[PDB]
Amino acid sequence: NKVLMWRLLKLSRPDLPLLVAAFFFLVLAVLGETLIPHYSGRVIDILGGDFDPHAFASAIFFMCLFSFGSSLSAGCRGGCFTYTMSRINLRIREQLFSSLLRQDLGFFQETKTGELNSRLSSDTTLMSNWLPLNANVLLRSLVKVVGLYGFMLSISPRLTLLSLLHMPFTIAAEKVYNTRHQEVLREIQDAVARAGQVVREAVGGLQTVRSFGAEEHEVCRYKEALEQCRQLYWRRDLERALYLLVRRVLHLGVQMLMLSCGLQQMQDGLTQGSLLSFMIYQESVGSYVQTLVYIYGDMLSNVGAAEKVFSYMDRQPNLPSPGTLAPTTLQGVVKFQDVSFAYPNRPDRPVLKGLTFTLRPGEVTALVGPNGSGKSTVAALLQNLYQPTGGQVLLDEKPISQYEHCYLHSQVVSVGQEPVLFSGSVRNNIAYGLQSCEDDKVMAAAQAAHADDFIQEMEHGIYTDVGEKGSQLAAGQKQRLAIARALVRDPRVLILDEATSALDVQCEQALQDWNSRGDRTVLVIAHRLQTVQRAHQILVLQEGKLQ
Amino acid sequence: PVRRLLGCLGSETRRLSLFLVLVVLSSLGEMAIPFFTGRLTFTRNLTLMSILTIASAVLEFVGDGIYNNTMGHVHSHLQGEVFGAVLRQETEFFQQNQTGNIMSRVTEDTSTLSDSLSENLSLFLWYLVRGLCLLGIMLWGSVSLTMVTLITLPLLFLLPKKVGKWYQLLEVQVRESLAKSSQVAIEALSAMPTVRSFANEEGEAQKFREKLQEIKTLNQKEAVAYAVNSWTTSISGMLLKVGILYIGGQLVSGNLVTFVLYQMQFTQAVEVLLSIYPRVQKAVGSSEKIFEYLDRTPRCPPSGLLTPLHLEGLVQFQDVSFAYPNRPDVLVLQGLTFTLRPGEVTALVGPNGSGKSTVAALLQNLYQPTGGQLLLDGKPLPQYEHRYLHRQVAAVGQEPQVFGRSLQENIAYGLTQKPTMEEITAAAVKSGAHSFISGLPQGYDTEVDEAGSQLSGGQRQAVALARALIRKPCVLILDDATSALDANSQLQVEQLLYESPERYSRSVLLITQHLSLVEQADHILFLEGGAIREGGTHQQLMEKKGCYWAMV
Amino acid sequence: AIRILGCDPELRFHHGHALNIRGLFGCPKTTPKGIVFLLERYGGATLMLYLLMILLSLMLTALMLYVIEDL
Ligand SMILES: Nc1ncnc2c1ncn2[C@@H]1O[C@H](COP(=O)(O)OP(=O)(O)OP(=O)(O)O)[C@@H](O)[C@H]1O
Ligand SMILES: Nc1ncnc2c1ncn2[C@@H]1O[C@H](COP(=O)(O)OP(=O)(O)O)[C@@H](O)[C@H]1O
């Protein structure tokens, strides 16, 4: 549609200097090609007629240099068209990914990661790869249409039937093909993205797949998805071939129609010398108009096939306006005021029915409850990951959402129930998200989390590569690096969402001194009361209510 | 290298041969108009040119339909076999290659190769037949000058042959740079709650941009390469035409005009053909990795052919030692020797990082021991059939993965035939998951999200336990499963471990770094530093050393 | 002469499929009457002017390739 095409022009705005340069070289290339056939024809006349070595040598000389200029000009416009294709592609890819990170956490429950990656990797090429092909044909045909019409204007009376016959036929019938060609392109992109998720699941969780011997089942599932894509390719190609067949029949019909009308005006007085030469000009300009219309329609269909990419890029996240507070000192007093919450992707099931607890610096507060009670959902609200549907959450008597995004997550940190690491060095996992951090601070955090014992034994020590999602570490070793990642930030408020569960008996007793400094605010989440004996305040949660 | 590409297309030569006869017939009808028609004075020209135009349009319509249909089969076949070859590789293959890197190769590299093959093959055949027709006309004009043209023609191959190697290595770097960027994107998108929590959104975006910059550097060289290639083919073609004209002029044989008028056309076909070779080399570089997967021999031993009708759960380790291939010089396990017997529960206890989960990996035949041997019912694990072995041996991982489908499909995952709901319900009841699954609004039909993000922390182990029980397994492995379970589920677990009559059909390996459930085990093994330091019953271990240093 | 290729062979193909350019009657004459006269009288000067425009276009594009990187 025109809206998406206009949006791309706004995105293609920085690249205009490359486009105008391409147009100038295109004109210069076609400017030469109308001069070479004169000299080549002159060579034929000299060779077959009265031969003359000097005229022959002069004729082939001018033929070479005009051909050299056109070849030189044509080479560099192909080059700049190809380059400006990649600039559009990379800018499109960078802007799309940067927009996804800004979305709310409810967005990533509605979508699959393998579909987003496939859409980012595939739909972006479909939206840019048409540039070096469509633009060259569209501009070259447009120039030649004007040039050929100039010759026919010397036979003006027959020209006024040129613009009346073929023009209304193609413009009206094109909308039927354009509407349906765009539809199948969208189906193809969705089907290939749907097939991409199969590879994402099979490869991402292979050790579970191989544990049950289900590799051949996954291959059968993928081949079923490929078959659904094959039938969509056939429909796209079969209908285009049929559409191409109709036009040339239609082109031939207009041809006979004019030749008959060409001979009808013959009786009214324009000689056959004009008509014989005119019909060649009539033939070519009719073909170029058909090509000009076809390329323009194809250009719009390709842009419209990637409609979902535009919808992702301009999607405003369902988040409150960014905060600005960033005090130089923070006491760390957190309190709930009748907080009620329901997940945005599934309302009508309230997870929290109302909470009114408060946290104080230097006092360890314990939260206990069975599975599904809502303990981790409370921790998410502490970190401003989700907004409560009722009540409010305050930090130092100010709303949690009013604090700056970068500032807040440096004062309030947490350790997840099942920690996730990233591919990289141990010193990168630790001090994750910090713009600058010295190695003495990192080692201090490792010692505080009792991680220095096993980090020393690694192949490169603190610089050893952690596998994908932490797959190259033990479960307890993963848990310790997650604790160090929080301690390295010197937090004011610390949340422990069952972090001690995966650690052995010795470490679960060693890491009981969270409040030794006396300035931090500590919240510990546990499943059973046999873990929080020295907690200063104990909260019991069941069915979303505190007892 | 080129033969490796066209080798796949050779499986369907019959369809292409039918395409070849149609295009040459369509070409003959198209060239018939200039040869036979005068467009002067008349009806004779009009009718035959109208009929031949329709015949050309119909013939090329059928030819294109066969071509597009055949290309679709080749694309789907190639993409299916690449994915099938990936899953045959060893477990170490998926640590050397990230999940975002592999998926880019299967999804995009394969589709680029077939897309490249689709456009060039039809264009190559079309110009080949017209070039031959143009050559035949030139033979009529002059036998001597055609031989001169043909003799000097191989000299034009030299320069595109040099550019071709530039395209290969240039395309390989572009493909692997896109794979690196894909890994960065999918790793961040799969962990957004952690990225959001640590405010690293702009840190991920910057890490993504460093990969696009590498692509941008290569794309600049691609644009220059195109212009160089476009300059050389056009300029070289001009010299071939001009050189013959100089010879023709030096030979004045007054009929040279009919040879020249078509020589100027033959060079235009050669100019197009010389542009095909650089993109053929590009396709070779654009598919190095996918063809590397297709012919790489996996590190695993082949699956054996043993499927006993009835099997006993007698599992015995014999001097087993193991070291991960990432650090083959550091042994993770040292001289393990213990036996599992039907009807008995063995508890494996040790500190974090002692190697307990590594023991479970060996038993599931994910890795091969570097020393000793491991036997199931007196036979090595590789001797059993792959699907048969993973029905007798089932396990619950330390953090079980849950696929994005319905709960009934997750419980019955990997089974050869779909069980009835009566079997699934029984398995869910036995694992305790029925207490909460029945409370869901859609019950067993509820779709779960990626990696089981919808389920609570402790409920995921209950669903994974049901998945293992439904196999009617002979060996059951419980890796840290019982920690997060409810009181109701814990009663069910200790009921199935120590009370249920179906115990005698099973041998159980219980792994937990806590004393929560190991008191009732028939045997306890203490693992530290990759070796078993102490072994015996609960009372025997108490008398061995005072307070055991692990419970007081 | 017989035109075995198309009248505009560069536009004969789009992707892997043919286009509607063929010599249904013949190849149009694209040499205007003014130009052919100009190509023999004062013809030698037009070649120099044509080449100079190419050289100026090359020099201008290279500068834009420099500016657009710094911008
Ligand atoms: N893919 C791997 N490559 C190399 N070494 C590994 C890999 N996975 C684990 N290790 C190492 O092997 C050793 C044993 O780890 P393992 O996961 O078996 O311990 P564990 O006893 O199960 O631990 P936990 O009780 O904490 O779950 C550790 O030193 C660990 O770092
Ligand atoms: N991302 C989500 N989207 C929708 N519902 C969720 C999501 N995460 C959890 N829930 C539901 O909300 C409830 C919150 O429970 P949870 O806080 O996970 O308990 P615990 O932390 O004690 O295991 C769960 O019952 C779960 O079904």
Ligand SMILES: [Mg+2]
């Ligand atoms: Mg473990």
Ligand SMILES: [Mg+2]
């Ligand atoms: Mg929880």
